[model samples]
Target chain A: EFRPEMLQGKKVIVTGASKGIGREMAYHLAKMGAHVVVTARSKETLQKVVSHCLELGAASAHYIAGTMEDMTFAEQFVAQAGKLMGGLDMLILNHITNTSLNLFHDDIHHVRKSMEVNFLSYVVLTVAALPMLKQSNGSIVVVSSLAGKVAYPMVAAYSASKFALDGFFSSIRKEYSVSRVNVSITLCVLGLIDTETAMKAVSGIVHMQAAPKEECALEIIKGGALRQEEVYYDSSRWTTLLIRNPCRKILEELYSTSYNMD
Target chain B: MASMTGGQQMGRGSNEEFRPEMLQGKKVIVTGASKGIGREMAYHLAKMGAHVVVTARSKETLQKVVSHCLELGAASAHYIAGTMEDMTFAEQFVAQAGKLMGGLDMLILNHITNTSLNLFHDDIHHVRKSMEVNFLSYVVLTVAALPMLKQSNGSIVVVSSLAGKVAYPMVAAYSASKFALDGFFSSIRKEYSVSRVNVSITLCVLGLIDTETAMKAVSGIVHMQAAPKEECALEIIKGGALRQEEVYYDSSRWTTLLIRNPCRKILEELYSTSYNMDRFI
Candidate 1:
């Protein structure tokens, strides 16, 4: 029964809203008449997103510029967004720092920063937003790729951070569910999304074509409205990738002699 | 909790970039040094001309290994006979080793208490003991060695297993301890990077190696070819000396699920087969 227009007058915060899916989500929510507050590291990008939201007949639009690496900034962002929107309904966790593709394994710096940006910030923001979420009986939507669920080669560190997300968020959700906490938790399991930035970073060597970010964006919103435990954005296709091998067979292959490095 | 506190030592960073030849002339500590990977590691480090401190349960075994290490061209070799299950013993072993060797360069945590499949089902106490001996001992030894390791720009080589990475039905307790080891080591590794601690950690994920003891233990359960203990030992040494985050020994065959990271696929497969828990129920 939840409709796109249900968000019309609701206040929501979307991080990474200055670009990509976050930006598109901002625009879509605005079009559907929501009061949306957006954030990203660049003020200029936030300004453009805010202006676009206004143009789309948003109830209101606001932008905050900051880096997610700082946990305090992450925490403050939720409270600030909640205040601006008078109460929060949907909290979209989507900000990610760019790690270099060519030299991912060259240094530990990228891995550490990825954890800060991708994992720690989510924890900080979620903990800070809990009170407000409890007040509004609001929903929190987390944007994660299928990479979070599966291991994508060459992006070992990146995938590790995504795995950490499932651990932390799933634990929190379990606690809430057991306690009968009313807040809805929606985790969007995404597949290859064809965003300009992601495309540029992955396109050159990527063997697979990306799913359209626009459709993925709509799917995220749909999941939030429906308050499903989890929704696969590219479900029609993503489901096909599932594999079933026993622990013994997997272990046998793993322990097999002569595994060489690439 | 009080007993566990005795094993806890404050962290000291060892931030040294690695070299394959870095062990030359360095002082090192090898735990569970009487046999298996630890004994082989002691041999290899000594052969590379490092002063080595070796420790394990049996004094006779330690003495023989120490002699073998000396013959292998170690700058100097020594042994400490004590159970690592006692965190106090683990801590003392490191301090004594540093004192004996003048300075410690590497701590190879290859020591695991003798464990059996039967222990998992019958004795929670034995399982607890296994955790203390296999996992917490590593933590204690690492912490105690940290200050000396930092002084010498040393490396920590944590020998974990594939079982630690994924859940296997029969090996619950062993996996729990190893998973704990992974979490703790990874956390410390990150802390070292962020806090600018000058230490490198190499986590070695091993499969069933043809170590005399392991082969005897896995005789019927596993029919696959086993990795050579010497090569496995050498690889652990290489991983430590080079400071790689993860090193897989038996690749191609042994670590497909891990190297592939087939999270959902592997689980689905497990659920569909005789391995499925529902079948048991």
Candidate 2:
């Protein structure tokens, strides 16, 4: 029940938009004639993304290049986006800490850094956007990973950040629902998408095929536009369903079978 | 339906069949061991002849706990006084406990920052504090103990709550910390398996237990029947010894399964009854 016309002139903000799915999401929104504001840590890349959006028939496009680890930047970016776009209708949170796969090495600093970037920044931005979102009865889309749903090897800190998102957002979503707030929240649980960063991280060790990033970005937008409570990325839908009622021995066996343990 | 604390009557179901030899001479560390389930776990492990290292914020209380463990026939008993709020202290405690025990066989993570029942106000500091003491500290302790545990083929028992599985209203930060534990430990468990490391991780999901702090927090607000703490402690020990992936205390098994319903409508309906939303806005 989604029409491309519904996005025309809608004011939207997409985070982590320098490359990959976030970049594609901005393009998709722009192509549908939405006013878009994009954010990432790279100024040069974001400049190209914003310019590309304008070339694709966007009503308006702007870029904010800064790291979300800076709490002040994360909070102020939302306010600036609202001011530039006139109002906010959708907030797509798609940023994550850069990841590397490895065994547990007891790096407390790395764990804390991951939490600050992946989890706390999301909270700070959401709180900053609340007032404008309530005014528009807008939607909040959380770009989570399948790692958030089912724990996998070598991504402990990353997985914890995503899990914390589900807990915090799901709780707040309920509060909004019962309090009769008009805002909507959608949690997108994605599997391995064939982004350059992801393919580089899990190339040989992980054997599963990666879903295309462009299609994944469209699905996220479609789910958000439809106001779905939760959406799964392609094959991850089935994997997520199976883990919902996880059998411990079977899960352990299945996970090991997917990896090269030797 | 009869409430029994630590006698043979209470041990009838699972513990009656549990052999004491399973934990005899096992080197164990119990955090937050000054009181409640942590204190009771010290007694249970001591009675099973475990070499127990008990820790808490209060030096005096842990002294008394170690004395009691010795009296209960523990093979060896030691006390370490510290607070989990300090990540450095948590890591140092694990290393010292491993050294004292000569090597570690099991780690019982039973500590938590005390939580007061409240709706989510904009207390970001409180949320951060909870995540630090409850979730991050667990990670710190586990990482510190990995080397010794890998050597001994040991086990880790994470004492979590039903709140982690189902996000209830009020105590939002506490629930978040516990949910983080599930995600973190569950991930590492798989990592250990993939790396071919010899270690077992058990997540213990508990229900309302008859403890002073817990009863005081939800005294009048919640009327759910509470299970006895001593029996709860025994179950945690047995589950860890058996290396079960997860252990549900009391009637929490049903609650755990109920929350796992894939249908969001029915799932939310089941959870709605657990909260008092009269003034939730």
Candidate 3:
């Protein structure tokens, strides 16, 4: 029951918005007549995304293109977005470092880099946006993964970063609530979706169907708008049950058979 | 009822029955062994006639710990002094410990950097340092000990904290590092079992222990009573010897169960009530 009128003239900032789900979310918000600001690593791609957002009936559309690995850029972007939109009604934390599936190879550098982009940047952005969010009673939508909940092999660094996000944000969410802050936090846990990067990464190894990106984008916005603490998208009944209980023996046996060893 | 024998035995029957002789002639490595819980574990292993290899950053302190182990009737005692931040030292120390003690039966990863009670700051440098010493070093040491552990069908005992399971305010960086360790090790534990590698990994989840470093960190901030490090060290050994997947110290059984199935409604209510918003704001 997500009404389009709810987003009319609302101010929002969506990160990683040049492509994939972020791009789709920008269009959806624009169609609802929201003031939108999008950001990504590419200037050309973001320029096109902003133009398309305006064409789709947005009140206003802007793009701030830069890599989130720079903490100064991550903190500054929120202030810039707030100034452009007048005030933020929602902050969508969606950017992530490029992921490659591999066993632990004693590569400490990869883990550190992953934390910088995936986890630390998110924290920096939120801390910068807190005051504006408090003033506007805005909501924060953290785009996480099923890997954050279930411990899977061959993606140790990525999984660890996602888990750290859940821990940090979930703790702060409670703090904000107790402190009488008006901000809302929503954590979106997603399974595989039909994104080009993801499909290519798991082409031969993973043999499961991926849900559509368009529908997944809508669900994330809907959950955030409703201020739900957590939302699961594209998870099967059995997958949900496994994450909930996580019986160790069963998980090990399933993982042993699910992926190719060689 | 008749007693079942051989393959029909249910549970870890031998592990359930604890005996001092079970540790006789066992070869062990205890990190952070110069003081606190690590030192206590070394003394306990010595009393049980185990061969022990101890390591810490202080050369003088390690010498005294090794001497104490030998005087307490250990079959063999050795010391390696180095910092955990150096990966090369962690690997070489494991190799030397195995050569000196004939083989490794248990690796007690008890070393951790001291963390002060504070809110999340923008100091990424401190967070990186903490991850290196507290979390990444554990991975390096475990990977280095894998060959010997596989040969002996041994156990790896990771001494973690309750902060790893539940996220509390302050100590955000420390909690993140511990949570990362839990996710990484829990995944690898399954990988080992699925691949039929003969080794066991036990994660010890503990609450406030009465150690010099821990006490100093929470002296005025936290008002809860701390548990004894000696008893905590013994429980860690028992859980590892029995090959339990996880051990919760300090009567935290309910807390462990709640973490396993964390209900959002209850967690939110409990957290909101207990947390002091005055200090944060």
Candidate 4:
């Protein structure tokens, strides 16, 4: 069961919180009386996000500006945020490198950048946050896209990074379960959301109706608080129905029998 | 080795039929072909009289494989020895291989970083290496091969793993790289379909195969049965030839039974309507 009160006095770190759904997630966390730290590439936007978070009666709020492209910064940001909060209760990985929709050509540079910022940095943050997360039995939330779960044209690099998120996190979830680590992993798979970045990039290409970013944001927070394994949110009703793979669950369970987890 | 006359595979669907004649004299390239499943694939292609080019880091090892391919009735065979860790080498190898073949009919991506099974730690270097070798090189290889593939209306076979499709402990970095291949290739497959690109993309998702490297990796933690590498190789080749979207191979019958995602097919089809056929192509 999800309760807004569940977030009261909770300490959370939100990445990419300067704009889009990341900013919305920070606002919601703050409104629920959570202690919050928001980070982004730009200090200018993050300062405003921290300002609004405080105005919304956050327990406390802070901002750390850094690029997810830098692994050193990714790790350092988490340690700094944990110190500010006095400890960590949740870590939300929501940043992605700037990308454009194009039929991929010879751009190995773009592909490498996508994996570094959109995927590798998340892992770095998780490693830094895990100790504090373990102490608090906190949740780690990941925001992903429809392209991650399936396939889409023009977002090949973006989709690859997102899918790598699923593969890495899901395996660690299993590891944590076996280790008896109480930390929860929540992976939120969202469809096209009405974010300025997405709309601008997708305007001429994707004709799919986009879900509201505010609602998308709230559902992610709720899913993490509830410690749900996977959350699917999309505008199309057909998508909600089609997204759940019952066979995957069956397969995972069957495959689990083969591993000597002890 | 006698060439198998017709497809009699147990795991394949009735629609995915393969005949030995389909690959006769076809120009094919196999990476990681010094040993294991990659070597097995090269040999199988050779038995069908396909012109084959094989590559790995060890020149002597690959040279032996190439010589054996000639003896096994390859219409022609060559070896290119290089490490996939270097992106330049990965891209250049494909063009050079294409040159040797005169053109390319199929490109089999089968190389992976040398990986061992262990719980993940702060070894981000290992993670980066995995993504670079197991995933990035495949993309670079495909990009280099695309022109030739377009000319021949050929196939690109990406050999992946069960870890790629689902989660597996003791292999987080490896799993991530394998999954990246799916996300990258599957997206491009959709693009190609919409853009009317004639090349086919086949992703082969395998359970633990009895490769020497794989057997060593899973020694302590995994107790499950491993599928034979020779059969695994043939299954992958058959899938590429038949242009199947995914080919599932495993020792476990139930895994093969439950592995496919028809749901993903329907989801992609439904979303395909959302893209207007326009200048994006």
Candidate 5:
């Protein structure tokens, strides 16, 4: 009932679109009759995704191949995408640098590098894209995790970076509200999602009880498409648990296990 | 001193006397000891007649407090003039206190540099340094005090605030530093628990307290009748002597907060909003 045709002619930019859910999101937006521009770390992967989007009858599709960890590339990439797509309607801030789940604590560089990729890069891109987003009355969709929502053991470094992201963007949102800015900030809190890449890491030990990555990807799009304040993908009420617990317990529980690690 | 009136006040004063003579014939250190709650505490402990070393940045105020402790029947009273910002000075000051008193039994870290009430959007480095002074200095002094504490089965009392529990508009640095202290010390607490060490730690979360120094600072803004600092100081001493997990010296503050359980509510409301606040730089 609430603006089902909101994205009928909207222009969107999805990062990390070369593979996984990012590629599928591009296809979904294309099918919804929106112009979609995709970016990824590899040109070959981008070529295949754009070919598939073309087959799916996207209004238009293009790619920018570069690593997001570079700040210059992060800013120029967003501006270039905005220019190519003619305007921006939504900015889906996804894409994370990968690390061994076991090696986070012993390594400071791992934490620093992850912050560069996962949080800092996102901030730079957001700041770079703010003007075009303001011009289009757009919304931003931030893809965070249950790990972001609560600290999970072994992912301390990753969790800290995500926690830092929560601090900065949330404060910026408050600033925008105080200033009466029109841009919507939608934070999508995700639990364990069975992405092909994630599944590859936990194939033998972890079970298949998690929501599908494609569904989570779609939920991210919905958060931006409808300008929702917040959204949840899982039905188990894990989202609500994170909201109700004290800060001490939240930290303690996050240190506890999830999905029964083998 | 004001006569204890209510049952709560008398109970607190008596409980504060429940402790072994751990400082028997030993020296001790107290910072922020020039006036207010710190000054009151310095005198109370001096009445127990231990050798007391007190310090603040003010030479005149430190002289007055040291003489006052001596009048309270302190076995010996000494004062040092210094600042915590120069950490070299802090370490040297602690060493000087220990040297003057002959051997250290307790180190009470209560000094802090004050900040004007301002928005959280101020310079990050400035705010971060507040953590360095208020929280990290405690860590440094604890590290320096370990040998002394170990020998005497002594104690360290860390004064924290309720701001450590929940978020507020203009106290981000203060909150973050206290939160970090909880993180660092709680882990160390577990280590002590595992080892069955006799050395103790007491963390105090205080609400509004009536102190001549802080009254003007908090007037009208805190919006609650201030708890007496003398009572708060006595409760803090009892908590350390008994080695409790955490001490809420002001019951009114604890009860009022517990009735609402406001920390989780604030966090939830923060989470449900249109912002994300998890990044570090």
Candidate 6:
């Protein structure tokens, strides 16, 4: 699963593929000879990623332009993307609402947008993609942040949405485990990726070093392919080391006995 | 007792130091108090002679809880019935409660959208509804209460669950909202620390308590031992009184051992060094 050959001819959809780590993932998957469909708010940027992906030896590449903030669009995008690819094998959810570093001060608009785009859209996409994924035993990959796992100022709204993803997807992963559903869920926790947008957002505010976007994107794909529950990536070894909590795993296993799944 | 000050340390304090008289004449508000853990928390506070105000969707039930609180020897007792689903009502309820109590020393966030244990399928609306009621409403309530809290150097106690800290089946939506509380409040707590905001925030991570609502919801689906709701509520109050950052309540000893992740603190302190606080300060 760690080998590039693992993704050959795999049908995958990458959201937020117009820019940053999402676009890099599309290119990396294409390099693996995968059938890929990319979507974002801007069709032009989406078209560029598709072109670049095709040039990189993709089995096939397509771009669908739509806003994930639109629930209907997220649902319809998955349905149409499946039609284009014949079936879904992997769904990398990497898109987020446009966010900036700011002290959260009564902007419920930003809060709602973050939840709608970063969190809610994935649920809608999954609802539409679950049938195809179940047929193939594919994986659902969620992109998150250090903010999602730990407290960070100036990104509370964004952090809330990412943390919600872990809660929702990780919970459903357990449900699927008991229900004998073969589809996998991978939550990727990242810290300070060196993307143009991210660099701009934290130009003066954030002082931490950032990991390479290319390696970060590859890690997300690798984790999904390997069916790993979570993948943590960061420039700082300390951040990556502390991000994954083994005690949490121990606690979850201990508490798992309390359930009557039968 | 003099109110805890801004420079006062919070978190990981001893319960032995907590005295019921510490809350005597202190102002407090408990949401979702018509029944279950919320009502229990209010009752416990009332017995400690706190000035109490409670709210829920059911007017009749709120009235009865307020009556019982007065009987429990609350310094004062009041009820304001409204649905937490309405952000408007959540923001305003704090104002009215503040008027009733003069000022708040503790704000107990205890409401949740009613949910039953079931597999999550195509229930996106419930997911959205849960985030709104369970997570966003708490933020609105906090926003409205912050002024009073800041003025009094008060504490905010957010009732969460084990589901908040870790994942569980059949509770995807509820868990999402609870996790959001940890994310949002925990971030602001850091901001407060740097900015010298004296107010404290305590997140109570509870296991399955023997609340009537919980019992019926998990009936036949869960086999875990349930902690007493009455005791759970008191523990919540004790944590708030001490201004602890987080409080864990569960029946299993093994569950207790794994709940506290020292890694989070280590991670937070290490990352805290990298953040540039010039802008926020």
* 2 against 6, candidate with superior lDDT: 6
TM-score, A chain, model 3: 0.91
Q: Model 2 in CAPRI terms: which quality?
A: incorrect
Candidate 3 clash pair list: none
The lowest-lDDT stretch of 10 consecutive residues in candidate 4 chain B is B6-15
Spell out the clash pairs found in candidate 4: none
> Could you tell me every candidate's TM-score relative to the true structure?
0.54, 0.86, 0.83, 0.96, 0.57, 0.96
- List model 6 lDDT by residue over A1-262, tens digit each: 4999999999999999999999999999999999999999999888889989999999999999999879999999999999999999999999998888877668887887888899999999999999999999999999998889988888888899999998999999999999999999999989999999999999877889989999999999999999999998988877766678888887778778878877
Candidate 1 vs 2: which has more TM-score: 2
In candidate 6 the C-alpha lDDT for residue A28 amounts to 97
Model 6: CA > 4 A from native = B1-16
Order the candidates by lDDT, highest first — what do you get?
A: 4, 6, 2, 3, 1, 5
Q: Write candidate 5's Cα lDDT for A17-114 as tens digits.
A: 87777877887887777788888798998989888888877778888899987878988998898889888988988888885434221243564466
Q: Specify the highest-lDDT model's number.
A: 4
For model 2, residues B209-265, the per-residue Cα lDDT tens digits are 999999898766555668899999999998888778888875444454444324432
State the lDDT of candidate 1 residue by residue for B1-281, as single tens digits. 74565421222332234343457777888888788888888888888888999988899999999999889899899998998877788888888888898888888888887764321212435445655687656766777888887786678999987665643333445665565465546646644653456778887888768787887766655455677888888888877776677788773453643443454645323322311122112
Between prediction 1 and prediction 5, which has the larger TM-score?
5
Worst 10 residues of 1 chain B by lDDT: B272-281
Evaluation by DockQ, superior candidate among 2 and 6: 6
lDDT of each: 0.71, 0.82, 0.79, 0.91, 0.66, 0.91
Better candidate number, 2 or 3, judged by DockQ:
2
Alpha-carbon runs more than 4 Å astray in model 2 = A236-262, B1-17, B256-281
Predicted model 4 interface RMSD: 1.1
For each of the candidates, the C-alpha root-mean-square deviation to the true structure, in angstroms, is 15.3, 10.7, 10.6, 3.5, 10.9, 2.7
Q: Model 2, A25-55: lDDT tens per residue?
A: 9999999999999999999999999999999
Worst 10 residues of 3 chain B by lDDT: B272-281
